[PDB]
Amino acid sequence: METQLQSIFEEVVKTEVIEEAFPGMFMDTPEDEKTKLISCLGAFRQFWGGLSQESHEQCIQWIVKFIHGQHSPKRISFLYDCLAMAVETGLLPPRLVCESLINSDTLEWERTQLWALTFKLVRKIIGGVDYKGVRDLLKVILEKILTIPNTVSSAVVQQLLAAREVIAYILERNACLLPAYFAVTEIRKLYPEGKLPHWLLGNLVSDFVDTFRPTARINSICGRCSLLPVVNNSGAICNSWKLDPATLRFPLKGLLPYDKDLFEPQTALLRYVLEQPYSRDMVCNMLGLNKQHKQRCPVLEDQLVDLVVYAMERSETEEKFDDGGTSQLLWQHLSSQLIFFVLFQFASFPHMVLSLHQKLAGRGLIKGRDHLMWVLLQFISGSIQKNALADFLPVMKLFDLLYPEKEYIPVPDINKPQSTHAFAMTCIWIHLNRKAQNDNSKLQIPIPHSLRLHHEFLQQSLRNKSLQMNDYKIALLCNAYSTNSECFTLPMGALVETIYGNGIMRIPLPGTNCMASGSITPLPMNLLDSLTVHAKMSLIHSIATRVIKLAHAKSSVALAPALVETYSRLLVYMEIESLGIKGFISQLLPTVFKSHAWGILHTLLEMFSYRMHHIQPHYRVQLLSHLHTLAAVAQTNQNQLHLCVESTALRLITALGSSEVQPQFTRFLSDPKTVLSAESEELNRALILTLARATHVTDFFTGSDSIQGTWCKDILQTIMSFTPHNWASHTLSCFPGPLQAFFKQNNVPQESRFNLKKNVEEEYRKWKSMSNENDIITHFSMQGSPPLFLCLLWKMLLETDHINQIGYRVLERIGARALVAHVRTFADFLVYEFSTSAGGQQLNKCIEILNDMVWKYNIVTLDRLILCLAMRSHEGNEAQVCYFIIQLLLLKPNDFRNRVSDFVKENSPEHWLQNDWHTKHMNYHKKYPEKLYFEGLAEQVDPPVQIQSPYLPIYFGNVCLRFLPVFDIVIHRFLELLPVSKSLETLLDHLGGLYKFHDRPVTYLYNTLHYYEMHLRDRAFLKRKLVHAIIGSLKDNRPQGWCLSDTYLKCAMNAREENPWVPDDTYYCRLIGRLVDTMAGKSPGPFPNCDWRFNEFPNPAAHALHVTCVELMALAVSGKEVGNALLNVVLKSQPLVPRENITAWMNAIGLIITALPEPYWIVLHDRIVSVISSPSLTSETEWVGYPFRLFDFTACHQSYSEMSCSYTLALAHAVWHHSSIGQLSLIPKFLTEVLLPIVKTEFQLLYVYHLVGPFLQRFQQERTRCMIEIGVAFYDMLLNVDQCSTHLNYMDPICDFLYHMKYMFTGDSVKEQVEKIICNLKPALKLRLRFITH
Amino acid sequence: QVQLVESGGGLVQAGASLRLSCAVSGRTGSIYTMGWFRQAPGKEREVVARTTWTPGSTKYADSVKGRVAISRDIAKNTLYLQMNNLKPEDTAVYYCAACAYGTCYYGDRAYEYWGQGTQVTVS
């Protein structure tokens, strides 16, 4: 072929050479430069016909190579002219010709005339190339233009500019060769953010990029860089906060000219999070640090270094003699924070140290050097065991930089905990010195001269044969000599024996025949905080070893109270999560369980219930599954062990966070039997109730009307097996819709009221007619028979007022596990008895004996009986009677009110600050002994059955604390039943003070008010009675100003008089101001700082958010009025709310209102419509250029209408930025059922795009159905605007955005729905949207 | 607490019109959406028309689509239901209901406050 082409195109050249040399011969009337060129390629036309399409590209590549091989520009132009006519006449495809002309390696910018002639030819024929091929040629042409240097000759510019005209032709919107979005995509790929356009192009491509500046705004969240989250390490993570681990930049969709701040690293965002306690999990999720390899993330590594420098800066400037007030608080946080990232190999200690040296070299004074070395000592002392020595040597350069070398550094006052920070430098050197002695030679490390006094003090104290706890001399030795074989048994063993109590007599525990070791004083927190992580690691390991040792020794002596108290305090440090928390549930718990210790196992579960705090959700689910398998088998048929297992599980289930429930239980859909109960109906009901509020608070079902398909169907369907039950109407009506639809079907028949009464009387008649004890015991304790014995005991002491000796033996044979069914049926029987009863003595006799069965005979505990009563399915008056029985049991006798009054008055819930809990614990049990083995029954029986069952260790719990989780459930049942309103007020008056010892009081109020907004909106006094009683129980245990605002304490704390307190705008500004200042970090601070390791919240912002939501829900003001008042804090000109910082306020309002019930945050839809109908969007006064200031809240505005229009868009973005996907699912219907019929102008259409546009990506990832509904709504609005407007001025930004939505999101999903909408648009819109249907 | 009192029903011939009114009283401002419902003698209560209170966005059921207009007067605290071209199948007791949730309007959440109703019998 190529030889044929050679002969053909040689004739073309040879024929033109003789025509150039002899003109005017055969040109009498030729065609105007058409037939000549066509006839020249006549031989090539016949040759091209006999070629397959496979040979076409090879033939054109050869022709281009033959034209580019010519030397005469006059001949190249002629051949190009022949080629141009071949494309015009349809003989040659334009794309292949353009591709071959531009890809030619002979085409160089130095070939100054071939360059111009080539691109002049491209300019003629490129118009006939399809839009995808034009995009391909756009890339290579811009690449060839990039090969031209910045300095060239002046004479060749006009010839080089021939390529600029092709770029000008491709970028011509009126030419419409390709979607303009394609063109700006290829331009930004070669000229990204930061690069300057080539001099040959210049203003051409720079102005074309600026035409997509509006589209980038439509797809950007206003003020996103200043939007900050509240750190909750709970359910998954929002994709809005994820960052590029290599650049710290947001992942942006498309190559658009987004604002400059969106291309910058989000240091302020990452810095704010790292400063917060328990941000460890959220920092990993942002940067994708899911533990894959030695990450060595330098942007995180450098940000940790900047956070250390910031702690050094705040170390200066006052802070005075006592404490730090921040600074020492930040160093404390830096201590535990940086350990994780270096331990799991995300930050490198040697690189951090030398990078810290450069940052600290010549940067002013150095006052926080000891705290810096204390932070660094945590890395060295804990990891130098096996890491190479060369990784810790850079510390030597830091020491020489921060300390005075000449004179001795004196020994500090070892009575203060700050001595461990002063000795931290010498401790670091002792670890470096021992790493240099172990495996000697090469490089020995000498101690400095300035640290000679600190070292002599540590060695002279190490040879002291008996060291005390009266100072920190012991902690200094544990910190310094932790990595020494025999030099660590001297200090470590000195503080392990002080809590073990090996000798010096024993001590009793509650009940009978239960003894523990002598020591009761645990190691204080300021001592444990003074220990290094390595020193605490050995303490954790030595305590767990002795427990396992005591567990295998089959010993009946209990662990010392100081041991379990100290071990619970060491379980606080999450930097020791490997040996502490993970080992407690995965190693110590199974080991104790496999050894049949029971006693020790009872201590570990009791320690968990009363001494844990910030446990990760997956760890709680692990313990929960262990509790279920522990209760079902292993024959744990002991009264005290079954009560402990069932009580501990109730706390885990009830305390699960709303956002934590789905991600932890969605993992067990394959086999939900592991995380459920097989016989405890109450626990399974408690889990259903916890699903109810978790799906409610997270708005999980908002949008879906069926539980099927979700994770809840397999959890609930399995719960119907094992423990089938019904739900009363007043409780079922509060569940989310799809949950009710699951319980209306899957309905269980219930034994009627008459059949229970008839069964109890027939069995009590049999009891009075039988004499053989063996027949009585076999019958009334038969497994599988109706559980009526508690009803029988009720019948016995109701008539005869006493119980036979067989009555105790029958209970003893039933067992603790099988007895809950008897309590369950006895609860129903109690309801029938009280519901069908005459008043007077006949009713007061039932109350008298019902208390006797609890307190006199000890047949069932108060919390076991009331939990069963509150977990019944009675309706109407029967339910009123059931709750009336609960009120009687609690308030009528003196047995429980005295226990609660004395326990609250004499005890404090801060166990971590207490050194005498066991004493105050024994004083209660010695005053109100609890009988857990039917002692009262066996003691007052006809021949007193002597009982000697040994009790298991009880270190913390009692009946008052065991009832507090059930009290949470009792309150919810009373709120659901309207006639039982008044009795709930009496409970909170008498027993409300018990919430002093609640573990999550603010969280409980938050869920209660949020879940029961419908039942408390029109009962404000009850809502105030609840909030004031629970928060009021902590007034003497938490600082003033910790929860309720100063205004709420001065106005909403008075009696009602047909004039509730209606807060003004000043109130809501101050209330929101407490959150904006807490998230900003203030040295005084709106709230007092608490040890977040022992609080229900992880950090100040999490605490500031919930107490604000709780207070707003406690107001006697509707959700609509409160929600609008929140929006008016920013959307109306308000003092005390300073502008220039309005995004921090919009961020807080978004966080606050998105956590409130729907009647609160729904008002945003009303506020948008008021802007949609505003004169700024409804007027027809035209602009020149895009009205950026109508949508940019930072620009200057000409009208108040423009100001509120932009502020509304900015606030609507902040609100939707923090909204759950369930709350965002209302937007498609909000667009189609509210905005669609009123959006008629072009500015209204753009305002809708600016509203929803930025959140398209969230619908792409989280709920796809909405993304399509929104996409069609945008086109439906475009057709309405197109039909109501005579003309449209901004059709290019509208179509650019619609193209961006296609290629980035909708793709080809919406094609037929959109195409029919396109066909009714005006032709100007159709030509721009020519490629949308492709 | 929010009280509602329907009014304006009675016996009307087929094809004629009727203008129901609802006297909204009590704690107005707690109301985000309001609607009209109806219930035949032996059938389940259906929804007729719903409105968002302050903006006035309307939403109509497919059974009465095109024949019915729902409106409100915030100043007079009154909800209106204009029913035109009445058919015999429209014989029912008509209730006005309010609700504080947007999902009452968008979805099918039950309304919270109710009136006793008014009889509309179209022969």
Author numbering:
A (entry chain A): 1 to 1334
B (entry chain B): 1 to 123
Pull verbatim passages from the article behind this deposition.
MED23 belongs to the Tail module of Mediator, whose main function is to connect Mediator to sequence-specific transcription factors, and is thus of fundamental importance. MED23 interacts with several specific transcription activators and is involved in splicing, elongation, and post-transcriptional events. Here we report the crystal structure of MED23, the largest subunit from the human Tail module. MED23 is composed of 25 HEAT repeats-like motifs organized into 5 α-solenoids and forming an arch-shaped conformation, with an N-terminal domain (Nter) protruding from a large core region.
The nanobody binds via its complementarity determining region (CDR) 3 to a cavity in MED23 formed at the junction of three structural regions (named hereafter 5-HEAT, 6-HEAT, and C-HEAT). Diffraction data to 2.8 Å resolution resulted in excellent electron density and a refined structure that has a free R factor (Rfree) of 24.0%. The structure presents an N-terminal domain (N-HEAT: residues 1–220) extending from a core region that encompasses the rest of the protein (Core MED23: residues 221–1334). The structure identifies 71 α-helices encompassing ~65% of the complete sequence. These α-helices engage in 25 heat repeats-like (HR) motifs arranged in 5 right-handed superhelical solenoids. In our structure, R611 rims the funnel on the convex face of MED23 and engages in a buried salt bridge with E565, an interaction which is conserved in metazoans.
